[PDB]
Amino acid sequence: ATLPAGASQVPTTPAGRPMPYAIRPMPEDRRFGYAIVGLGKYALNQILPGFAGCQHSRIEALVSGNAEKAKIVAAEYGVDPRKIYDYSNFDKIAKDPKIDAVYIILPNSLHAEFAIRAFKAGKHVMCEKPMATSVADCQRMIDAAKAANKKLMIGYRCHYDPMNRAAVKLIRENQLGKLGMVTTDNSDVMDQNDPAQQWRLRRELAGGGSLMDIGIYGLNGTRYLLGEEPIEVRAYTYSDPNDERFVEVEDRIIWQMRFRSGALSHGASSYSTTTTSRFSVQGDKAVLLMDPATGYYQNLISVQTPGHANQSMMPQFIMPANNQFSAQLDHLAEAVINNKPVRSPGEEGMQDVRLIQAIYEAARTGRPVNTDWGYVRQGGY
Amino acid sequence: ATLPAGASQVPTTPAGRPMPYAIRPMPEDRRFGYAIVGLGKYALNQILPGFAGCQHSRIEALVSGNAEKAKIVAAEYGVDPRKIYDYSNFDKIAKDPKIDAVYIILPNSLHAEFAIRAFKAGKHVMCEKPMATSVADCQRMIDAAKAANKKLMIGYRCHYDPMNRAAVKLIRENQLGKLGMVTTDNSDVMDQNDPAQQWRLRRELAGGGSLMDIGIYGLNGTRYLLGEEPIEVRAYTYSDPNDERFVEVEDRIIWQMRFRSGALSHGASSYSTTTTSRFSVQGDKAVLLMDPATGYYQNLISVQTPGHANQSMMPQFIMPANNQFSAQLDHLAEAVINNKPVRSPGEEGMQDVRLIQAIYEAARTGRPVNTDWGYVRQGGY
Amino acid sequence: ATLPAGASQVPTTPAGRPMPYAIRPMPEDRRFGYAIVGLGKYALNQILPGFAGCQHSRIEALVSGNAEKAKIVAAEYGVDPRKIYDYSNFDKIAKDPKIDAVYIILPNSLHAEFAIRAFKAGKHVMCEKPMATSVADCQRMIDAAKAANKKLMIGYRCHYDPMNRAAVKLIRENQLGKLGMVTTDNSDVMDQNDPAQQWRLRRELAGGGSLMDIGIYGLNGTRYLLGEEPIEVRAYTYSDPNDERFVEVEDRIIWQMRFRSGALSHGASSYSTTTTSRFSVQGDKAVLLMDPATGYYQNLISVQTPGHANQSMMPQFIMPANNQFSAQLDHLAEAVINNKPVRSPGEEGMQDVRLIQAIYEAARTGRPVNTDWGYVRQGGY
């Protein structure tokens, strides 16, 4: 009959109106300052552009071994040129109190050194996966963090991704029933002309082939989806001997794991076949399919039963949670500010590395390897 | 047999490496400065966060009627507090030479005044859809732009969206065959408690109901998908008389159009039913389905023939084109810098408004309205 | 620990075992005998092969005007050659008591005559859609059925299709909320070289173009999905004047309807664009998409809300309901045997024909046509 009060009270003249409804995550502050270490592929395509969507984090400094590249990137991102560092003068960030944390986006073998160096500079450390190339180095990093009284977070972006968290939630709410089979597959074609992949062919830098680089998503994913750790592992690997890419590292590897609950998993990683990021969890009541499972964008999950497929993915007009990149960045910031623990700490990063080494041993010996070593996931999956 | 040269030449020591491969759009500059006018729902959720992904644009100033809100937003976005303006002091932006363009994100009826005022201040104008609430006002805005020797762009985000451009491309490449039927549906539930919707219930501010607000996507979309203009239009509208939201404006309206080619279209808009953004184009060789068609995120297109459904949407790891928000922003910047014309100019915005008025007349009279007035789309669809 | 009793009691020697679990509809009898009238496209591809899946029906006789064709078909289907009739000797089926019903699969204009003739022969009549080409003929058929004390069923296969019934169920269970918008589209390319389509180009035989043939699915579907009848109708039609197929009948037609509940619908039919069978129902809580909506096989339904798409279609190993063809056939049989009414009676067939005529009038005059004539759907939708 008549218009509502709020509609009728709007002026036809230019006037100030209130704060609008948020249908997306809005910015708060830029109180946490980061120093980005290693201006490569992941850093420039994903990390550096992910800072804009953060609610509490900011890019404070850059550490790079390419001066011209660093000067360009600093200009692109509004960083002070006086805040550009190199690998030799790296330790001088300890004098800057505006740098709260350090994000190491270097190649695998150089992770430990710079983490440790950052801990000695009194900084918090966000380190990329995989943690280190050895179990001892993972331990060294943890010890150094403890000694410095700083936080160590591993860059497991899937622990902050909405679709992956949705999947975990429904599994935890018993929608699939009793879990018995998990299947993962993660692959992408290795290109040696790409500079980011050049160190990945080198065993001394990478620390392993496809399992270390992308098989780890299927490995870490299996653990968080099941909410448990494997007690036994078995594996096989093969790479074509005439392929020049696989001289030092593995192309394809298949691993099987047994969990205390009775659950089994079979997974694989590949450097020679196209884009695959597919996870499947089988329960007695339903089956969950994640394809794409661990993408940067467009992840989709589906719960299937006979005659039904219930799918979820991000909405078309709203953004109910923030993206995995911005959320990961803000997570360390929030844990530091609020004095809470980190969801992806160094012990979690150490566990994957230890399991990878066990998988590599099982593939090498051809025997099963016991991995029942009592790792307990702090704060849940 | 042996490793490739580039893999073997990588040092095991920390070293500078080259510029990495881009798999996403990287920043270039921030050479084009914008003044954002109207700090509301669209501005705060979509526009302001879309600036980060631009390659040439930057937020230079803010114009708002809410000072406290403006001070908060400026702080969030790094804007100088000295660059915050209000509606009375709006014309003083002419003194600032760092402000290149003005983006008007005000309610429909206030679009013309501020556009004209910005043209008198020597600025380029990006104006939101729908252009104005009258055809004469659209004309006034165009005249003012011409007189100022400035560019006028209407905020049709779908003209810069990758999935929508993909759809146009395949239609143009004859994948559906000879086109004969188009079906569009755009709807969302109108909430009067939301402040952004309060002016939308008012005829004096909005200039029409659902067709003006969301039916325009289906209308503009039909034209770009077909690549032609309608010569005849017919319509019907209904709103429940006891619903307090539809006292001044229309809830539901259905319109049918005829094109010179022989093609027909049937479409509708609704303020009382949930999220629908679905377009369908029927040809004699294939049928194209766009659902979601005009979302902010997650658009998906599908080409169907018997036994087949070929789908496209954005990739999971790469971002081959930029998003619709950032691209729209950068478009005006690029046209100004490179001296090229704008893809969504004022004449295009004027055409939709003229067609909407014709549709409203046809619904009011119950007779068909001839719309064969010789509009030619400059630069294509 | 030990095996269960039933597993342990199975002999290792060849032995008779029980009746197995049905995961599909099993045969019961062949107690209802049908005479198939008109050995054409629908009859030979869909109807005649659909008898095998019936639980109570059988093909008893064939009536055809092509003797050679009839002799071949009878041999294919195991029908007695003595039970083959022609159009002149049609009435002699009254002497056969093994023929319970007659299924008329003739062209539209010949429906009434043969229905009436079958009623005079004391048979039940299953007649194909559309019922007749006139409202009076529909009435004549109904009167004749009443007088004979026989059942009249119209061949609306979608009233016996599992996916279509599933859709109705969820709408009725309030899963979409309050309904406001329905969109239907039914099309297929008309080929004049096909003999089944040759009578469809003739107005005297077909009784109308695309609306009569395939637009009726969208019309009947709208009514059953909404669970109500339209009180007002509006329409437009166009066919290209140089196209030789559309000299007597319509190619494309778009119709809009208003329901007493407030709901609106917009739909269309086409003879010149490819395979489209798409229905969409918009509510305030959710949106239902049926694509394919009225196929012979592979129908799929989807309930969408932001971030979700819940789909249903037939299961991969089980068949919980019978197919639409067999179920339709068995329906008339079951109503006769159990003395219950038919779900798709002649009054329902008469209603569609009356609405089609109203739609044709509205398209011809260009004015809205009131269709509030008090039709009540007996036994529900």
Add this chain to the structure above:
Amino acid sequence: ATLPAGASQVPTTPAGRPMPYAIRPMPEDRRFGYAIVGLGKYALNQILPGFAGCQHSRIEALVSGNAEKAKIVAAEYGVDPRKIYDYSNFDKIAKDPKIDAVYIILPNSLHAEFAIRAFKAGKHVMCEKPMATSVADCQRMIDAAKAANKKLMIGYRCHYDPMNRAAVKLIRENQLGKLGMVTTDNSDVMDQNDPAQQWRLRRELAGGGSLMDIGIYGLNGTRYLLGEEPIEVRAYTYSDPNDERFVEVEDRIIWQMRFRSGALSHGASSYSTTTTSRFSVQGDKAVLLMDPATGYYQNLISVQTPGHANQSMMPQFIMPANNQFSAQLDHLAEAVINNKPVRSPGEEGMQDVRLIQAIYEAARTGRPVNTDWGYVRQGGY
């Protein structure tokens, strides 16, 4: 302008018309007579109803150990009661010349005996998967067939399924590129109250657990998709020791295979988790997903690349190929009549059984088993 000749020549009077266009497979004859052996779950739900869609086959006789059940089924299917046999009088089918072949749908361990007995009765044999429970028995069956000069076909329904054949075709046309990874998963929850599953828990009757029953789809499928045989196999199995269903047979088993081409595969079968029939083939150009892969109905295939998913499944109005059941039945008939070889012969059935035994050995020993024994697939995959 004017109507076409064929449309204009149609009479308005009842007249005979030609043979219509087939959009589905029509019947030809019933020249091949089958004797169905074992009236159980598969026979009654899939096989017996699949005869109706055959173009050359017919059910001639029934062999069963349950007389009451056999009498009911014969009546349902129109079989002469004089043609009902039991296991003792089985050999008396040699006197009937109307019985051309025998279809053995008995439990696994009883397959060889009845096949051999049918070969001595001068009949062709269609035998169900898995061929036998031993390699020697498979060999005995082959020898017996050779000696009788009769054909032996194994019931691999997926070799006659349209979606599975479509998948093979595109792989063969190089749409995925160079193949490197195959992943299969086949599972369904084992119910001991179902009589069909009671012999499946018994090792003496079944010959193995899940791999023998459903893992074989993933095993046979991998071979036909790759178009090659494995030279090496590795496996692991686990069943919960307190579960009463898995006392004699395996619940879950995971197997990995290596092919001469370099390709790898990882697959699994399960008796304790719900309906899964998912195959994935990874190439360097694209990835193929089959889900459902080996269903009775509704199989769907999808070719994925970044930003694209091209799907295929059966059409909504046409049926371009016959179903897997009817086609399998007609295949043996056609090979006999036309003197061509069978696509799924005994050597193919023997190969799967030999590979299964090798997989069981590898799981038992925990060592890899060489399977490079020179099997050549006759007539292709």
